[PDB]
Symmetry: C3
Subunit: 460 residues, 3 copies
């Protein structure tokens, strides 16, 4: 009797799980919203610098209208290698945000110290990938308490991580110079100091890592193996040649119904072989509406949870009216941000700029009266941005990348408490001019020669 | 000199052969119509129960318009495993019909006894697959004389098996309770009784299998190996890691021209990479016209052959006028049935319900005067049904699944001699009401709360 | 720590390199136009005979409108095997032209003799493939000095080989009978005569190969291995199981920008997963405009280079005006030919026949006054031709095949110095009849019952 080879089956449920971390794929938690969970772990925030510039460049005539295709190709080539490292060292990639990504190693408190060592080593191997484009990487690491929030409605779900380790990992990464691995103070507080040579960082309790210098008889591979005891989903045994246990998921309608809610319809369409796999890679003009919500305490998940849910229910019904799409949600320095987009592929509408502004105002007014929301700020910018599926085959997400994405983000941060917009949006919208106010020019981190900015004042 | 690896070539001819059994693929017989052939073998009729219900359910709002995608996924996952078993135990899968399938082990008369043992074991291993959805399987087995009919015209070909083993395998399967393997009387008559523990079945000469209990020194794997001597196409040698010898077919225009006639144009389009692979998986409203032809002797292939051919030539020219499609042809309890469909993907027409009724009447009137056709009955029902490619990668077919498919089938059987229709077809058609007659409600096996049924009486 | 398997990555840059020889892929030369390079090597011109006939046949009703699909399938099946041989014996496939292909073994002068032996053996193994369709192969081999020309503009590039070895390899192949391997006189002059049994060829200095008869202790495999020392890109080591080193190319924007210019936009679209992979295989009516340019000395690359460039700049701006496309450029017996096509897939325009004629006249008049161009001849024919990607997965090109392609080629050769056209083009064009002159019928190699031919005289 033959024993023929089983071919890898690439079922829809497996294709969907590529878009989600194990935190969600194997999380099996209540379908009630908000849902909050609490655990400990180590975070790695890997930032690529140089891509919003390359993005601008690939618009130029030299790429012969294959700019989006070339950009996605070169981007994925690099990011794939970072994703392999993270996964092979046992991390869960939680989210992609432009050219950056956040990864988690979830463990019991007592194992934090050893895991931090695994993560530091992963970090240094990722720094190593780029001694070989004007691109390099900064890495922030944090460790401690983490909360998960799941929010949404009956057809769509989003998740977020929250808490002091989350805010820290961002702080850490923003202190880094090109090539630094920075540890949060709590990460440095909890780590095995006999292993790692650091240096101080100016007016900063965080630290920079210089070296991983392990004692005479330390064998990384045996240390790693001990560490895998604490890793629920590390591929092993018959499946040790796979990057992710999720590659072995089998059809299961209940599970697929749950997971599909995290993924955009147009992605699902491609997953279902009803749209060419290259239709979603595009350099196309869009409008980013970037919404920031600040709370008195952005680590109190039980407080901010209901608020984010309340805001999400409003934001989604307002966006629905204009094929606006929430592309990502995540904690910023201050607050929870919604990266919303008008004009993704297959979703254009006329008078997009006007609608973006009115939808922004509507969100601003509703969110400003939600209970625990202390301040709403919204940034609106329009231009050519890259849209596409970024990452590795086994772990990837739809993202947007562009100077306008960064500008909308910097506007909501540098002009808090109002709805602001760029010149492009101001000029192309069809609204009375006295609904705007022209603003003072602020010098904004990672932004040059933005034309005039405006506040969208609305009627009076 | 390198000896590089040859990649599996997935030529069109190989993709086409996935839709056909070895009986046709390697049959190389005359292109004249009808063609009849005569042989012996063992048949396995594997029925899944629970799928026309799941089908109804996947229409519900909870599947978020990915009902067809989820249904095909979960269905193929299960049916694939059954197809692997059948093929690995050396069977030829002849046909898929909804959620059921018919398999053949063709052998010389003197080998029937040993083969029946292989098939029983395959059966019990398939029962085993579902101790793990509200779905299970019934299996009927038969053995004896079998006839093949090939019929059609210059562009399309269909085949059918006919004879007492064919009628028996159906009888057997319809006696089964959930999980039974039933043997036909002749199968039980011919089998190695020292191997198998049976039990009697009420007012029935057939039997149920309880156990395969083989003598002290019986080694299944050596027994199987001896059995493969009689299996023409069992993959072996260099190709023992393949499920089907047909995976090694090479381009051959003469052969491809012949095989393509069995497959629907829209499938060929997908095979030719001219249509997305997911366009044919759909939950869509259609009209089933189910045509049953009864003969005085439904095992006399030389008699019924010319008649089925004569009917097919008419039916195809009438359907052609409305993009109606013959989806399958097969012997029922009584007679030869044509499962015809109006509104498959890419094939909708307006006033589909009207046309279905007029085409039915036309077929009824022509077929009723074909020489050896004793009775024509036609069932017409309309609703949401699943359309798609069901089975394994290496062996699959386009099929339809739905409560309306079963209803049209039960109508033609429970209201013989007339053209009948459902409420949906009655209400939506555009014909004078006095062309119909409202019928008595019959209680019909595997059917609840069908609204009123009607006879399509036609003009007078 | 796992070491998971890397999946073959099928990046766009690798898909693009399938369309190009290593000569271009790894050539890294100046982007200035014309560019000329000079080297030595051995050439193999492999011609298939029988395909323009099969092509005509696959138009017939028996193929049920899957003629293009069947033709490409059977063609690639055969041509793939020839491509594997050539690559495994270390050749660089330079170009496909209909059902023929040109291959190069580039080496230092001192290694010509040994390489010629490798190539002869490859040739005889390719002859061997077809003892098994009314198709066989003729092979011409040449050796000596070769020049490369690269020409084009900022968005498109073409290349050509030029010189006496190039003209010879064609002469040689045109002397061959079905199944002969013919060597050019210089090839025979340079080869290891102790190895090969030849015979004379009538009124011809070239020779036919009868046998490869190697001395007592000659071991082909060790001889081959020594020969690979001189082969820059022979896959080896970790990559010895690949047909081409180009399968390992990594994303590199600069390189991709350069390579993409050699490939048609519609191909790039399919490469980018923005068009179904089967859209470019078609039997479709087109118009071939075949342009031949003769120079006093068709081996003087430094002379003919600027001229071909000058002509190309004109030809491309004239074709652009009508979605006309240059499909291939190559040296003929006399001169440089441009195989231009009106009506490729996605590129039809109305009044195609008229435009073909006016574009031909325009090209004729401009090219006739380019400096070193001694004679321009243009052939115009219209009909059903096969369009598609021909070759192996790892090495393939878009080509056209048809009796009309050959006719346009024979017209420009047998009616030099004028623009000629066929009956189809004459009848369907919308021009005054007195712009044409009906010509004497010439008996033309590999052409029967072409209706009347005409000269396109133009206005007076
Ligand atoms: N797709 C995306 N998702 C989430 N945030 C994004 C984003 N694209 C841009 N941003 C926001 O834009 C802000 C500016 O980003 P930075 O991290 O300072 C740019 P960089 O990494 O130095 O170079 P880059 O712009 O080439 O990536 C970030 O704080 C980030 O939150
Ligand atoms: N695609 C298809 N091809 C052929 N016949 C079909 C069909 N779909 C339904 N039928 C017919 O419908 C009739 C009713 O089928 P049954 O076998 O009694 C249903 P079941 O298997 O108990 O549960 P199910 O409806 O979930 O499959 C059958 O006799 C069958 O011939
Ligand atoms: N796609 C293509 N590219 C370049 N030239 C082509 C071509 N198709 C036809 N031709 C030209 O047509 C001419 C006639 O070709 P031959 O080589 O004599 C035909 P053959 O090989 O005997 O049989 P065939 O027509 O079945 O291939 C050739 O000289 C060739 O240059
Ligand atoms: Ca960034
Ligand atoms: Ca069934
Ligand atoms: Ca040829
Ligand atoms: Cl997050
Ligand atoms: Cl059948
Ligand atoms: Cl060339």
């Amino acid at each position: 009797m033959n024993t023929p080879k089983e071919e890898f089956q690439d079922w829809p449920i497996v294709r969907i799980a590529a878009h989600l971390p194990d935190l969600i794929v194997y999380g099996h938690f209540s379908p009630e919203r908000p849902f909050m969970d609490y655990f400990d772990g180590v975070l790695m925030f890997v930032d690529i610098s140089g891509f919003t510039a390359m993005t601008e460049k690939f618009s130029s005539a030299m790429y012969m209208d294959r700019g989006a295709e070339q950009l996605v190709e070169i981007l994925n080539y690099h990011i794939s290698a970072i994703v392999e490292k993270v996964l092979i060292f046992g991390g869960d990639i939680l989210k992609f945000a432009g050219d950056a990504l956040l990864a988690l190693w979830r463990v019991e408190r007592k194992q934090l110290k050893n895991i931090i060592t695994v993560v530091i080593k992963c970090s240094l191997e990722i720094h190593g990938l780029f001694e070989t484009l004007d691109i390099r990487v900064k890495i922030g690491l944090a460790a401690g308490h983490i909360s998960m929030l799941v929010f949404g409605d009956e057809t769509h779900s989003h998740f977020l991580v929250i808490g002091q380790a989350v805010d820290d990992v961002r702080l850490a990464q923003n202190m880094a110079q090109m090539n630094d691995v920075i540890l949060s103070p709590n990460c440095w507080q909890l780590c095995d100091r006999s292993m790692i040579e650091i240096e101080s960082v100016p007016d900063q309790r965080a630290v920079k890592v210089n070296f991983l210098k392990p004692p005479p008889n330390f064998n990384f591979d045996e240390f790693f193996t001990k560490c895998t005891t604490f890793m629920h989903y590390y591929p092993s045994g018959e499946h040790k040649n796979l990057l992710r246990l999720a590659c072995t998921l089998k059809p299961d309608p209940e599970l697929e119904m749950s997971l599909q809610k995290y993924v955009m319809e147009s992605i699902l369409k491609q997953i279902d072989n009803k749209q060419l796999q290259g239709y979603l890679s595009e350099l196309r003009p869009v409008t980013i509406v970037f919404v920031n919500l600040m709370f008195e305490d952005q680590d109190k998940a039980e407080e901010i949870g209901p608020a984010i849910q309340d805001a999400y229910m409003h934001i989604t019904s307002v966006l629905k009216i204009f094929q606006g799409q929430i592309n990502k949600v995540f904690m910023f320095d201050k607050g929870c941000s919604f990266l919303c987009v008008f004009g993704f592929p297959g979703e254009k509408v006329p008078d997009e700029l006007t609608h973006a502004l009115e939808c922004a105002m509507d969100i601003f007014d509703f969110c400003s009266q939600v209970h625990k929301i202390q301040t709403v700020s919204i940034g609106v910018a329009s231009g050519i941005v890259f849209c596409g599926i970024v990452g590795h085959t086994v772990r990837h997400e739809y993202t947007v990348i562009g100077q306008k994405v960064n500008l909308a983000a910097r506007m909501m941060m540098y002009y808090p408490g109002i709805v602001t917009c760029d010149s492009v949006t101001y000029n192309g919208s069809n609204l009375p001019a006295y609904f705007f106010k022209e603003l003072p020019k602020k010098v904004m981190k990672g932004v040059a020669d933005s034309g005039p900015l405006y506040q969208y004042w609305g009627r009076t």
